[PDB]
Amino acid sequence: SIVHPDNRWYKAWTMFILIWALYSSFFTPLEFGFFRGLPENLFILDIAGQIAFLVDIVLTFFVAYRDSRTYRMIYKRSSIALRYLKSTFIIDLLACMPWDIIYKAAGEKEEVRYLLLIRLYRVHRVILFFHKMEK
Amino acid sequence: DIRINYLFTRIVKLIFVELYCTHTAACIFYYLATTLPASQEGYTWIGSLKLGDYSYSKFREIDLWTRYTTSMYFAVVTMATVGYGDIHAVNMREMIFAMVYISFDMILGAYLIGNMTALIVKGSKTERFRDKMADIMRYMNRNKLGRNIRGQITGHLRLQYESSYTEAAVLQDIPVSIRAKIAQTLYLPYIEKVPLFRGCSSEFINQIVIRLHEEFFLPGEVIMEQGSVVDQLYFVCHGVLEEIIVAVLQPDHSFGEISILCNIPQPYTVRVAELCRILRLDKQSFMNILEIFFHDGRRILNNLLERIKQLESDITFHISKQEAELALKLNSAAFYGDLYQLKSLIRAGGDPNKTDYDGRSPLHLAASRGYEDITLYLIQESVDVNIKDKLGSTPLLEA
């Protein structure tokens, strides 16, 4: 099915994931510099923090485009997927894969740990929130 | 260059100047350390310098690439007015240079802030949009407008927020003569494709492009209602409309022309289906243009046919009656002796020599009422004197 992005539940979902955006944009520099492998004391937290950003990747395939040229709506399936797969699907999926598990179980290399800085991209969600307050 | 903003370019110029003076001041500062003998290197800013473990003892063979960064690190910290104290001047000749570099940069630093403010003070799309909504919300609250209307007025303001509009109160500085040519370049291709204006003269069509206005409508809005009196004529140039579903409106079409010609109330409701751009024409402006182009007016009615017979008969009757009506107006003015009233309908009206349905030259009424002054003017037009009505009389017989 298709859900219009106004029915008081998708907006509550986006506001819920904005909390994770604040957490994951402030914790990413804290584990790249200080920690060097993310010890097991917070192993569950790392896995749990990427679940909220993984369901949204498969839950953003049910939205309304509005087509940006004829402001009525878009409800077809091919249009939604082609829109998302062209804009930010590659960077959202890439910033969701576990890099701490890959880094340690790869003959630990510091080069492969620089991919954590990709996860800093999701601070743009907080910037988009401030734009809505201006309007 | 007009492609890029000039205020933003001025900001980049000041940053380059400030970062270049920092580079120059770093090279000069190291020179003031080498102008002392090597035996007195303990009195220099770098010779006596000692970081965490490094000593900077020799100071003259220190792998230049790590001798320039230390000097540049001093200059950047001073330029930004941060201040650490790990690197500082010690002798007399380095204090004097520091005073003139710090004082010079203080003026330059406050100059960057001044140009940064001027960039912001110009405004933005969000700032201008926010001001408009403040007035509209205040205007609607005091008049207690309905909630349905408030959803339309606020909708159109967000429509022009993105996809920047023509930016009104700016194009008004353009003279009307120049703007007249601008309208032809833009609106002509859309008008020529309508079925109503097929075969019309170029002179007639040109008189319509000058007095057109462009408007946008969001999907779901209603322009005309069933049974309403049409006061505007709309040309569809973009988007799609649905007439209520009994018909679908495509671009390069016109709707509402039936009501404005036969004086019939609008029979169908037009509904916006997608974002559309519409050109509108007023009723008063349309009829004034149509009256002058009498020959073109007949073609419009004929093209519309391809109630229809009644409209066609009325159109042929409308053009037949207007020639007789103007004759009556001139005779009435001459009967009451209003010289100024009849003057307007002579230079841009009808022929005074013509007679009405019964046959009444203005000389007949003038001679019957003894108005000497009006008689002089009719002589200037060389109006025939021996014109006879359907009675055998002459204008001289009334005097």
**3-state secondary structure labels for all residues of A28-87:** HHHHHCCCCCCCHHHHHHHHHHHHHHHHHHHHCCCCCCCCCCCCCCCCCHHHHHHHHHHH
Q: How many CB atoms lie within 10 A of CB B33?
A: 23
Listed in sequence order, the residues at least 6 apart from A34 whose beta carbon sits closer than 8 Å to its beta carbon are: none
Of A70, A134, A135, the CB nearest to B219: A70
Q: Which chain A residues are closer than 8 Å to B273 by Cβ?
A: 72
**For residues B164 and B158, what is the distance between their CA atoms, to the nearest angstrom?**
10
Residue in A with minimal Cα distance to B134: A135
Do residues B303 and B277 touch, judged by C-beta distance below 8 A? no
Residue in A with minimal Cα distance to B220: A72
The B241-243 sheet, strands edge to edge? B222-224, B270-272, B241-243, B247-249
**For residues A52 and A92, what is the distance between their CA atoms, to the nearest angstrom?**
12
DSSP symbols for B248-273: EE-SSEEESHHHHHH-PPP-S-EEE-
Q: Is A69 on the interface with B (CB under 8 A)?
A: yes
**Angle at which helices A10-32 and A124-134 cross, to 10°:** 130
Q: Which chain B residues are closer than 8 Å to A69 by Cβ?
A: 275
Do residues A123 and A26 touch, judged by C-beta distance below 8 A? no
Q: Calculate the alpha carbon distances from B173 to B176, B184, B186, B213, B367 in Å.
A: 9, 19, 19, 17, 54
Q: Calculate the alpha carbon distances from A101 to A5, A28, A45 in Å.
A: 35, 15, 13
**For residues B72 and B23, what is the distance between their CA atoms, to the nearest angstrom?**
7
Do residues B254 and B194 touch, judged by C-beta distance below 8 A? yes
- Structural tokens at position B156: 């159109």
Is B263 known as a binding-site position?
yes
Alpha helices in chain B (DSSP H): 6-34, 65-79, 92-121, 125-143, 147-161, 176-191, 202-209, 257-262, 283-292, 294-305, 308-336, 339-347, 362-369, 372-380, 395-398
Place of tokens 């960039």: B119
Q: Compute and round to an integer the Cα radius of gyration of chain A.
A: 17
CA B173 to chain centre: 10
Q: How many CB pairs under 8 A join A and B?
A: 20
**For residues B34 and B173, what is the distance between their CA atoms, to the nearest angstrom?**
64
Place of tokens 């330029």: B79
**For residues B61 and B46, what is the distance between their CA atoms, to the nearest angstrom?**
13
Per-position b or e across B80-116, b if 16+ CB within 10 A of its CB: eeeeeeebebeeeebeeebeebeeebeeeeeeeeeee
Q: Which helix (H) or strand (E) holds B216?
A: strand B213-217
- Inter-chain residue contact A71 with B130, CB threshold 8 Å: no
- Could you tell me which residues are beta bridge partners of residue B216? B277
Residue type, B385: V
User: At CB < 8 Å, which residues of chain B contact A?
Assistant: 126, 129-130, 159, 161, 218-220, 239, 273-275
Q: Is A68 on the interface with B (CB under 8 A)?
A: no
B42-50: Cβ within 8 A, 24+ apart: B43/B90, B43/B91, B44/B90, B44/B91, B44/B94, B45/B74, B45/B87, B45/B88, B45/B89, B45/B90, B45/B91, B45/B94, B46/B70, B46/B71, B46/B87, B48/B90, B49/B86, B49/B87
Do residues B274 and A72 touch, judged by C-beta distance below 8 A? yes
**For residues B239 and B246, what is the distance between their CA atoms, to the nearest angstrom?**
18
Residue A70, classified by CB atoms within 10 Å of its CB into exposed (0-12), middle (13-18) or buried (19+), is middle
Is B100 known as a binding-site position?
no
Do residues B218 and A71 touch, judged by C-beta distance below 8 A? yes
Of B130, B161, B218, the CB nearest to A71: B218
Residue in A with minimal Cα distance to B159: A71
**For residues B102 and B88, what is the distance between their CA atoms, to the nearest angstrom?**
13
Place of tokens 């751009």: B277
Residue in A with minimal Cα distance to B126: A135
**For residues B370 and B176, what is the distance between their CA atoms, to the nearest angstrom?**
48
Do residues A64 and A11 touch, judged by C-beta distance below 8 A? no
Q: Calculate the alpha carbon distances from A104 to A38, A107, B257 in Å.
A: 9, 7, 76
Would you call B208 helix, strand, or coil by DSSP? helix
Q: Which chain A residues are closer than 8 Å to B239 by Cβ?
A: 70
Question: Residue B58: what are its φ and ψ, rounded to 5°?
Answer: -65, -45
- Structural tokens at position B98: 């520091």
Listed in sequence order, the residues at least 6 apart from B294 whose beta carbon sits closer than 8 Å to its beta carbon are: B319
Do residues B345 and B376 touch, judged by C-beta distance below 8 A? no
Q: Which chain A residues are closer than 8 Å to B161 by Cβ?
A: 135
Q: Calculate the alpha carbon distances from B39 to B10, B44, B77, B191, B306 in Å.
A: 48, 11, 29, 92, 109
Q: Which chain B residues are closer than 8 Å to A134 by Cβ?
A: 126, 130
Question: Residue B388: what are its φ and ψ, rounded to 5°?
Answer: -115, 140
Q: Which chain A residues are closer than 8 Å to B152 by Cβ?
A: none
In sign, the C-alpha dihedral spanning B188, B278, B157, B162 is negative
On the CB side of B320, CA atoms within 13 Å amount to 7
* Residue A112: DSSP 8-state: G
**For residues B290 and B275, what is the distance between their CA atoms, to the nearest angstrom?**
31
Residue in B with minimal Cα distance to A69: B275
The resolution in angstroms reads 3.1
Q: Which chain B residues are closer than 8 Å to A70 by Cβ?
A: 219, 239, 274-275
Q: Give the distance from residue B41's alpha carbon to the nearest chain A alpha carbon, in angstroms.
A: 39
Of B126, B129, B275, the CB nearest to A71: B275
Residue type, A47: I
**Angle at which helices B65-79 and B92-121 cross, to 10°:** 60
Q: Which chain A residues are closer than 8 Å to B218 by Cβ?
A: 71
- Structural tokens at position B70: 């230390």
Of A65, A68, A71, which to mutate for an interface test with B (greatest number of B Cβ within 10 Å)?
A71
CA B118 to chain centre: 26
Is B228 known as a binding-site position?
yes
Is B232 known as a binding-site position?
yes
Q: Give the distance from residue A135's alpha carbon to the nearest chain B alpha carbon, in angstroms.
A: 7
**For residues B139 and B196, what is the distance between their CA atoms, to the nearest angstrom?**
41
Q: By what method was this entry solved?
A: cryo-EM
- Inter-chain residue contact B126 with A135, CB threshold 8 Å: yes
Of A71, A134, A135, the CB nearest to B219: A71
* Residue B53: DSSP 8-state: S
Beta pairing, strands B213-217 & B253-255: unpaired
Residue type, B262: C
- Inter-chain residue contact B219 with A72, CB threshold 8 Å: yes
**For residues A13 and B10, what is the distance between their CA atoms, to the nearest angstrom?**
44
